[PDB]
From a paper:
Remarkably, the same elements are actively taken up by methanotrophs/methylotrophs in a range of environments, since their XoxF-type methanol dehydrogenases require lanthanides as a metal cofactor. Interestingly, XoxF does not form a complex with a small subunit, but forms a homodimer. Here, we report the purification and characterization of the XoxF1-type MDH from the acidophilic methanotroph Methylacidimicrobium thermophilum AP8.
By cultivating M. thermophilum AP8 in medium supplemented with 0.5 μM Nd2O3 as the sole lanthanide at μmax (0.051 h−1) on methane, we aimed to study a functional neodymium-containing methanol dehydrogenase enzyme and determine the structure of the catalytic site. The crystal structure of Nd-XoxF1 contains a dimer in the asymmetric unit, of which one monomer contains no PQQ molecule and the other contains a PQQ molecule and neodymium ion with approximately 70% occupancy. The loss of the PQQ cofactor from the enzyme is interesting and could be a combined result of the exchange of buffers and the high salt concentration used during the crystallization procedure. The two monomers show the typical eight-bladed β-propeller fold of a methanol dehydrogenase, a conserved disulfide bridge above the PQQ cofactor and an aspartate residue coordinating the lanthanide in the active site. They can be superimposed with the structure of the cerium-containing XoxF2 of Methylacidiphilum fumariolicum SolV to a root mean square deviation (RMSD) of 0.8 Å. However, a detailed comparison of the Nd-XoxF1 structure with those of other XoxF-type and MxaFI-type MDHs reveals an interesting difference in the direct vicinity of the active site, namely, position 172, which directly precedes the Nd-coordinating Glu173, is occupied by an aspartate residue in Nd-XoxF1, whereas this residue is a glycine in all other known MDH structures. Amino acid sequence alignments of a large variety of methanol and alcohol dehydrogenases reveals that the presence of an aspartate residue in this position is diagnostic for the XoxF1 lineage. To accommodate the Asp172 side chain, residue 240 is a cysteine in Nd-XoxF1, whereas it is a bulkier threonine in XoxF2 of M. fumariolicum SolV. With respect to the XoxF2 structures of Methylacidiphilum fumariolicum SolV, the presence of Asp172 (replacing glycine) results in a rearrangement of the loop containing the metal-coordinating Glu173. The coordination of PQQ and the lanthanide are almost identical to the coordination in other XoxF-type MDHs, and therefore the overall coordination of the lanthanide is not altered in XoxF1 compared to that of other XoxF-type MDHs.
Author numbering:
A (entry chain B), B (entry chain A): 32 to 619
The structure:
Amino acid sequence: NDDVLKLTENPKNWAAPGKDYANTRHSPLKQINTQNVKGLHMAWSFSTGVLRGHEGQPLVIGDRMYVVTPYPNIVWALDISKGNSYEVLWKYAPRQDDKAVSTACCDTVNRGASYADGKIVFNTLDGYVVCLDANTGKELWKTKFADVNKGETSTPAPIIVKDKVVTGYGGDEFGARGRFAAFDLNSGKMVWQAYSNGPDSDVLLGPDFNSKHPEYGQAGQDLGVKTYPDEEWKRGGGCAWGWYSYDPKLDLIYYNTGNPGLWSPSYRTEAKTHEEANEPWKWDNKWSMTIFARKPDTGEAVWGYQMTPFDQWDYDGINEDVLVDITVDGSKKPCLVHFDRNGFCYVLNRTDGTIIRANKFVTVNWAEKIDMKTGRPVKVKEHSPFEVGKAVQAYPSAMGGKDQQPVAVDPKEPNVFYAPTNNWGMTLEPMERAHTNQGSVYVFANVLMKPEKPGVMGRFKAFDVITGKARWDIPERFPTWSGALVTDGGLAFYGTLDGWFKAVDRKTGKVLWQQKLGSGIIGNPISYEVGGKQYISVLSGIGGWIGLPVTAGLDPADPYGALGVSGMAAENGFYNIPMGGTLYTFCV
Amino acid sequence: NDDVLKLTENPKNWAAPGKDYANTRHSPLKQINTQNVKGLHMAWSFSTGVLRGHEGQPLVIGDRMYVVTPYPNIVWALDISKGNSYEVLWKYAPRQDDKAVSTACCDTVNRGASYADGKIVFNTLDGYVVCLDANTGKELWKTKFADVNKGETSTPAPIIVKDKVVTGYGGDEFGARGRFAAFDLNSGKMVWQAYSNGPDSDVLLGPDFNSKHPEYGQAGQDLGVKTYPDEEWKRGGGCAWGWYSYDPKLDLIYYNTGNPGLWSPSYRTEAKTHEEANEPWKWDNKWSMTIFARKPDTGEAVWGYQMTPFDQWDYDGINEDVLVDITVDGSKKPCLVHFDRNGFCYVLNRTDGTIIRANKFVTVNWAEKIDMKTGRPVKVKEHSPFEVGKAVQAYPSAMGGKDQQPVAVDPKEPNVFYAPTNNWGMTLEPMERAHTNQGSVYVFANVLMKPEKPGVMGRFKAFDVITGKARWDIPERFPTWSGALVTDGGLAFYGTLDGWFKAVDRKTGKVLWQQKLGSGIIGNPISYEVGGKQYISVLSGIGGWIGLPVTAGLDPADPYGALGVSGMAAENGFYNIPMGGTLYTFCV
Ligand SMILES: O=C(O)c1cc(C(=O)O)c2c(n1)C(=O)C(=O)c1cc(C(=O)O)[nH]c1-2
Ligand SMILES: [Nd+3]
Ligand SMILES: [Nd+3]
């Protein structure tokens, strides 16, 4: 979209969820810098009137700001032309089906909206893709996309590519079937949809899909139905509830798929042993856990790389695909950096999916490494949950080395990424499958999480995606479940789950400014400019999967609660973090 | 209470709801003043995890803060020893009966807690007087006082007298019978209770009640039975849901009663005309609308003055009674200043209730003045709603010249009060009484409100309670529903319903600092000191009666909703103020 390109190119705006199509989350503004960040102070705050995890970020287009709250997903439009104050312009309150609340696995969170040609597009938890007039907030059109009865809920933030609104949804834990569709920007009608599994026609494979990497899986083999048992692909997960990227020059949309569904691996293979089930090409559970590159016009996939075939830990691969150009191995190549849940930082050639680098960015014991030739992980049997009635320990836990919280990078130094990380393990015990009803809880496994190192759960690092070494490592008592933000002022912004919003030096990582906000910070900090002055805004309010024991009011005495999070939350004082929702803005 | 006197005498604390027994709401901390307030910035914020109106204020004792949220009335204990940061000590979540929400007339608010001898006392909306251990938050004792089935809800903040916990409740609009009782600070029973009407034995009228002012009403006449029709006193209102004060030297507790029940005056008298109904001593509806001075040990009343006999406007007299010594009429007299809802600022001799001054602090057209000789208002017929089916305009509206938002005064200059004010009128149309069921809405009147002057709703004034003239008047386009705070740094603090927190100069009223918070401010600002640094804290989140159309989600197309607030709220952009709940702390 030409308008999105113009807006995102202007450093004064935050026109895209991740600041641009490449999801760099980098701001060239330098008014706020290392020299004066000590004087950072709140300018104004805005309550959302809603309580639960406040994920995502606001959108800033010139003098206007748009905020999307969690369920019921209220859209607030604010006038910020004065910079040091705000004025509510209008409010859009969609009437939703509350069944989506109980059909949501990890919270009633929303990851933001997108803007283009005077229109605002967002996803409601009940699966509606809505387009509103940016000026008056009048509903231009809404299209029912996700079905709650099939276990699908639309948590992510869609993006706009030339004239289409592309997005997915979640629901692998409810037996849903992943889908990624495009809707006309002006009409809202569906143009095409690509399933994460099923026959080749259902996946919309390109004519030259993985032509350069036949070892990744090609068309004409119907891996979407064969790498699954009889018809488990119908409940085979693969939901795309993560972040979406776009390469204008190459005309490629990048997105990833979730887990293959239920957490009992024996039910995703006909083999009886871990060794036989992991036989290559037999039960890969494709195309779940795959990084896709599709053409926006038709949706045909140019290439696709599955990171975790035959999943056994719920290592959803949806994490954002940051696009940058890095000089590595003697030349400048168009790279795609992706911090996957499985604990591996993948560096791929965004032109054909070629594996450039794959290093562990957290403790990883389920796999030895990623085989460069076959592109498959060298799994460790004693750290792969397979049998029913046996608990197996694994690093990282189901939450992985990094969940949906996005990373940030400065393109001028594309090899150094600022990334929040999870540092806890788990013991997952598969259970017997009690039903095959789509739209109902479809996990069948008991989980227990202990933080790897007591007193240390989250870690904000300056990780070099080429050498696999971190410049600095900041350990935090609470998890680092907020997005990152890097600025040309020499600062890196992130927030902790107990409410601390911090600013650190990009070079050393020492904290230069910090303030404890109202609640846990699971939003993504943004940087924009109004009236010639720079502002930093971030959402607060505990929630998400990490905050489910609090937002859902679960019992702290049941450690298995929340898929293995209640016990860890109860042990690390999460229940003492009050709920909330509020946008904090700072200036110098 | 001895402990309370010392904690309140120490300027570093805010140990009482109104900073002290006299409710002066004045802080001597000059560490923050008129020359550096421009640099006042937020130090930290704490979300309550609860929505709707956040009235009241926190309690700072040493370096421990206690905050009482609105329903379910969660009590948060914060460790503020670090000063610029906070840590939760404990949390108390009471199990309540949800009908208290539907039985609450004007939002699910709470006005704070009191502290003494390591104990925290507060009121739950469902009518429970709770005492918690300050250190651990454990429940020391719980006593059921207010009955929801009888239309009673406990919104006010109790205070701790020597060894008694005294409090009242609300529910005049539900046909409740007002009561004011005391409870043992250690065990928790009711030591005594005094009704606002009924036989003299129920009102606890001492042998020397109104000795120096027989024209007020004396014991032995059973006015609480005569001034009402046959048995309407059973639903005679008089609830004491306002602020309570205490004079240790005189050993007297000060509290006032509310309206006498329904808003259809023809049902609170057996006369057929306004003149006959207003005959003195016939239908006074005593002891509603009465300022009471009682002995804490027995509860017997030393004196009582009814400001509005035979109420016809719902001019609840519960407003705070600030106790100060003022040099007037040739000498320094122990006074009681009270900005009543009827629009008159009463200055009475706190020893016997003698009327010293009665000045109009806002536009008042229902009464010409207050006669000293009779102590009764000179009513204006054309502005006194009486008959059924006749809309009658009145200044001020039912919300009065000033609702529960407390005023502030510096005893150094006891004649000048910093008081928020309401500046809108109404057209009240009495209606036929459809029922006599206690516990159900008991009003029977169609109300419509409109600001007296366009573009002006609230006004923060510097009012001389002796001369009746205002030093300065600050007009606000939104209501000034927040309490006031005055400091020895030459500053006065208050907030607006749209979220603006302001710091004005005491001498001129000029705004020296202002910031828009997350939501409407209906909380009371406080000043305290920790680690040698002065801090300013206030609660935010729209609510209360003024904000009920937003918190209750009332139809904006129903002007009569919220007892007339909906129409005015819909016209002055109240619906664009998001809900919230968050405590903000500032420092220089
Ligand atoms: O597999 C799915 O269908 C699905 C959805 C979501 C979601 O929609 O929020 C999460 C997950 N899976 C998941 O595995 C996960 O760890 C997770 C964390 C969060 C969050 O917002 O904090 N959502 C989700
Ligand atoms: Nd998942
Ligand atoms: Nd009332």
